Design an enzyme around this catalytic site. Structure first.
Site, PDB file in Angstrom:
ATOM      1  N   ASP A   1      10.609  12.458  -6.618  1.00  0.00           N
ATOM      2  CA  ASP A   1      10.650  11.741  -5.357  1.00  0.00           C
ATOM      3  C   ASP A   1      11.640  10.570  -5.422  1.00  0.00           C
ATOM      4  O   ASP A   1      11.326   9.385  -5.189  1.00  0.00           O
ATOM      5  CB  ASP A   1       9.282  11.220  -4.916  1.00  0.00           C
ATOM      6  CG  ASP A   1       9.283  10.693  -3.468  1.00  0.00           C
ATOM      7  OD1 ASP A   1      10.286  10.948  -2.741  1.00  0.00           O
ATOM      8  OD2 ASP A   1       8.334  10.024  -3.026  1.00  0.00           O
TER       9      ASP A   1
ATOM     10  N   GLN B   1       0.843  -1.180   0.000  1.00  0.00           N
ATOM     11  CA  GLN B   1       0.000   0.000   0.000  1.00  0.00           C
ATOM     12  C   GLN B   1       0.879   1.230   0.000  1.00  0.00           C
ATOM     13  O   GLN B   1       1.857   1.294   0.753  1.00  0.00           O
ATOM     14  CB  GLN B   1      -0.937   0.018   1.198  1.00  0.00           C
ATOM     15  CG  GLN B   1      -1.935  -1.104   1.157  1.00  0.00           C
ATOM     16  CD  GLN B   1      -3.030  -0.905   2.155  1.00  0.00           C
ATOM     17  OE1 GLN B   1      -2.812  -0.318   3.227  1.00  0.00           O
ATOM     18  NE2 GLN B   1      -4.223  -1.384   1.821  1.00  0.00           N
ATOM     19  N   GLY B   2       0.552   2.176  -0.880  1.00  0.00           N
ATOM     20  CA  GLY B   2       1.162   3.483  -0.872  1.00  0.00           C
ATOM     21  C   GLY B   2       0.287   4.470  -0.125  1.00  0.00           C
ATOM     22  O   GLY B   2      -0.716   4.113   0.493  1.00  0.00           O
TER      23      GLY B   2
ATOM     24  N   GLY C   1      -2.441   4.976  -3.137  1.00  0.00           N
ATOM     25  CA  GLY C   1      -2.927   3.857  -3.914  1.00  0.00           C
ATOM     26  C   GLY C   1      -2.254   2.567  -3.488  1.00  0.00           C
ATOM     27  O   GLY C   1      -1.640   2.491  -2.425  1.00  0.00           O
ATOM     28  N   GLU C   2      -2.392   1.562  -4.357  1.00  0.00           N
ATOM     29  CA  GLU C   2      -1.899   0.221  -4.120  1.00  0.00           C
ATOM     30  C   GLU C   2      -1.035  -0.191  -5.298  1.00  0.00           C
ATOM     31  O   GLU C   2      -1.099   0.409  -6.376  1.00  0.00           O
ATOM     32  CB  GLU C   2      -3.041  -0.807  -3.966  1.00  0.00           C
ATOM     33  CG  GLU C   2      -4.251  -0.383  -3.145  1.00  0.00           C
ATOM     34  CD  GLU C   2      -5.568  -0.944  -3.732  1.00  0.00           C
ATOM     35  OE1 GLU C   2      -6.603  -0.217  -3.711  1.00  0.00           O
ATOM     36  OE2 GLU C   2      -5.570  -2.094  -4.244  1.00  0.00           O
TER      37      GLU C   2
ATOM     38  N   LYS D   1      -0.114  -0.292 -10.746  1.00  0.00           N
ATOM     39  CA  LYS D   1      -0.324   0.693  -9.705  1.00  0.00           C
ATOM     40  C   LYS D   1      -1.729   1.233  -9.884  1.00  0.00           C
ATOM     41  O   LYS D   1      -2.101   1.638 -10.991  1.00  0.00           O
ATOM     42  CB  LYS D   1       0.701   1.828  -9.785  1.00  0.00           C
TER      43      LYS D   1
HETATM   44  C1  LIG Z   1       2.868   8.909   0.949  1.00  0.00           C
HETATM   45  C2  LIG Z   1       4.000   7.895   0.657  1.00  0.00           C
HETATM   46  C3  LIG Z   1       3.966   7.213  -0.742  1.00  0.00           C
HETATM   47  O1  LIG Z   1       3.993   6.016  -0.738  1.00  0.00           O
HETATM   48  N1  LIG Z   1       3.926   7.942  -2.070  1.00  0.00           N
HETATM   49  C4  LIG Z   1       3.858   9.467  -2.094  1.00  0.00           C
HETATM   50  C5  LIG Z   1       4.656  10.424  -3.000  1.00  0.00           C
HETATM   51  C6  LIG Z   1       5.067  10.248  -1.539  1.00  0.00           C
HETATM   52  C7  LIG Z   1       3.896   7.053  -3.282  1.00  0.00           C
HETATM   53  C8  LIG Z   1       2.490   6.501  -3.526  1.00  0.00           C
HETATM   54  O2  LIG Z   1       1.558   6.916  -2.910  1.00  0.00           O
HETATM   55  N2  LIG Z   1       2.301   5.429  -4.526  1.00  0.00           N
HETATM   56  C9  LIG Z   1       0.941   4.869  -4.760  1.00  0.00           C
HETATM   57  C10 LIG Z   1       0.363   5.293  -6.276  1.00  0.00           C
HETATM   58  C11 LIG Z   1       0.534   4.241  -7.114  1.00  0.00           C
HETATM   59  C12 LIG Z   1       1.134   3.072  -6.253  1.00  0.00           C
HETATM   60  C13 LIG Z   1       1.017   3.549  -4.711  1.00  0.00           C
HETATM   61  C14 LIG Z   1       4.488   7.670  -4.570  1.00  0.00           C
HETATM   62  C15 LIG Z   1       5.813   7.391  -4.933  1.00  0.00           C
HETATM   63  C16 LIG Z   1       6.362   7.988  -6.077  1.00  0.00           C
HETATM   64  F1  LIG Z   1       7.647   7.743  -6.476  1.00  0.00           F
HETATM   65  C17 LIG Z   1       5.605   8.852  -6.857  1.00  0.00           C
HETATM   66  C18 LIG Z   1       4.288   9.126  -6.504  1.00  0.00           C
HETATM   67  F2  LIG Z   1       3.568   9.984  -7.290  1.00  0.00           F
HETATM   68  C19 LIG Z   1       3.723   8.531  -5.372  1.00  0.00           C
END
Ligand SMILES: C=CC(=O)N(C1CC1)[C@@H](C(=O)NC1CCCC1)c1cc(F)cc(F)c1
Length: 451
Positions: free
Chosen positions: A304, A193-194, A197-198, A213
């Site tokens: 990121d 889990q993000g 999203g997942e 994703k």
């Molecule tokens: C909050 C912590 C986190 O896990 N992120 C947030 C940005 C920090 C993930 C995230 O949510 N990913 C979800 C969306 C699709 C799969 C799960 C993320 C990572 C990235 F490299 C780029 C993004 F746009 C998002």
């Protein structure tokens, strides 16, 4: 027109493309370019589009199982040193350093150095033939490779096993596959889990293994995303997780190359993870830097970069995932670089303060990632909390060199944390610095002088 030979099984997905098995005889028209070609199988009679990387001309050097093209020195060692490979596992490749020479790479074992790869230059004779030492020559590479498979005659070891590889990933799920509908995709195992999203292991058209994703509704616009993915779609690099496709109906699904051994942060913690030495850590960081260097050459921005968004594969291949996604998220907190969802400890302060996300803020992040790599995943700024990291960084503070990080690396991190973006190093530099970090003595190639 030239008959091409198939180098791998490809299980036909759609209507318009062709199934074939390794070895099939396929007909194609010579001057074709692109990633998907039109073939007529002289074997099966069937006809369709095939991925151009899965074939090579009939009877050409490229056709051979052991011929690895213009793979790189550093990466051939990755494949050969796989610990299931017996001694004498070899490959043949083009030399990065001598114009048109080839090069034979061979795994061996040594009391000093452990298990190691030995590289032999193969120069082409006036005759079209080939020699590793003037004393023993052939009319073709294939004869050469035959002969040394029977006696080492100078080589460290007789050649025994062709280097084992994996099916490359095609470039796209099939010709003309960009936006696809939910029903082609099967979600099997959910992987994590993000915050927005997942992440899922799945299958497309009951054939190809993919990552999927899934975005939580209201995260980005499907319009904004699609116009963005016309850019991402163009970023092809062997150290960028390839963006295969997308479902543009809320909830957005994003279909990506499956990475078998998960995120880097996960992998560093936990076993197969607690026992990696610096030269493999540093080979990982160099892989990320080659991924970001291409991003750099394409005037793009990740936004990121950190160990949670590096994925790992077989033989410690590492790849940069979810580039340029983070820009499109609309969460009025996150976009303010605030809230429990924002990686403040990896965020260059000008990004934190002025939204100025640039390739240089990505270089900052990369320096933090190097601390993650040298701590097997420990959080950065360990004694601090997020709410406080901004002030402390704007007030000049930096991380002490992690215990067990060579000060030469830590001083590299410090270039990544220089206050003023345009004096932080580029990714080209970060890439070259790390592929050359360990300097041995002369034996770059084995001297074929006389063996
Ligand atoms: C909050 C912590 C986190 O896990 N992120 C947030 C940005 C920090 C993930 C995230 O949510 N990913 C979800 C969306 C699709 C799969 C799960 C993320 C990572 C990235 F490299 C780029 C993004 F746009 C998002």
């Amino acid at each position: 027109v030239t008959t091409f030979v198939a180098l791998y099984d490809y299980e036909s997905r759609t209507e318009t493309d062709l199934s074939f098995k390794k070895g099939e005889r396929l007909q194609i028209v010579n001057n074709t370019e692109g990633d998907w070609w039109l073939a007529h199988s002289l074997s099966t009679g069937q006809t369709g589009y095939i991925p151009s990387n899965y074939v090579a001309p009939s009877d050409s050097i490229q056709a051979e199982e052991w011929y690895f093209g213009k793979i790189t020195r550093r990466e051939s060692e990755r494949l050969l040193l796989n610990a299931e490979n017996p001694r004498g596992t070899f490959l043949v490749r083009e030399s990065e350093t001598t114009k048109g020479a080839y090069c034979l790479s061979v795994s061996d074992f040594d009391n000093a150095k452990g298990l190691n790869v030995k590289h032999y230059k193969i120069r082409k004779l006036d005759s079209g033939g080939f020699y590793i030492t003037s004393r023993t020559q052939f009319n073709s590479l294939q004869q050469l490779v035959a002969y040394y498979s029977k006696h080492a005659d100078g080589l460290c070891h007789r050649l025994t096993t062709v280097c084992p590889t994996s099916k490359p990933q095609t470039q796209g799920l099939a010709k003309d596959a960009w936006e696809i509908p939910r029903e082609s995709l099967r979600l099997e195992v959910k992987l994590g889990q993000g915050c927005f999203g997942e992440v899922w292991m799945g299958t497309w058209n009951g054939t190809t293994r993919v990552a999927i994703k899934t975005l939580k509704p209201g995260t980005m616009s499907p319009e904004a995303f699609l116009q963005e993915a016309q850019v991402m779609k163009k970023l092809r690099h062997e150290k960028l997780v390839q963006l295969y496709a997308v479902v543009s109906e809320e909830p957005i699904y994003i279909v990506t190359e499956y990475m078998s051994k998960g995120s880097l942060l996960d992998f560093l913690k936990g076993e197969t993870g607690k026992y990696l030495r610096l030269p493999q850590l540093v080979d990982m960081a160099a892989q990320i830097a080659s991924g970001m260097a291409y991003v750099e050459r394409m005037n793009y921005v990740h936004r990121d970069l950190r160990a949670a968004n590096i994925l790992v594969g077989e033989n410690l291949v590492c790849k940069v995932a979810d580039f340029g996604l983070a820009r499109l998220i609309e969460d009025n907190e996150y976009t303010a670089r605030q809230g429990a969802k924002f990686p403040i400890k990896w965020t260059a302060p000008e990004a934190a303060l002025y939204g100025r996300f640039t390739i240089k803020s990505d270089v900052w992040s990369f320096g933090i990632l190097l601390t993650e790599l040298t701590t097997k995943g420990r959080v950065p700024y360990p004694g601090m909390v997020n709410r406080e990291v901004l002030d402390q960084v704007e007030r000049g503070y930096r991380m002490p060199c992690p215990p067990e990080c060579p000060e030469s690396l830590h001083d590299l991190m410090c270039q990544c944390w220089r206050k003023e973006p345009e004096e932080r190093p580029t990714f080209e530099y970060l890439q070259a610095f790390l592929e050359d970090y360990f300097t041995s003595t002369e034996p770059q190639y084995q001297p074929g002088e006389n063996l």
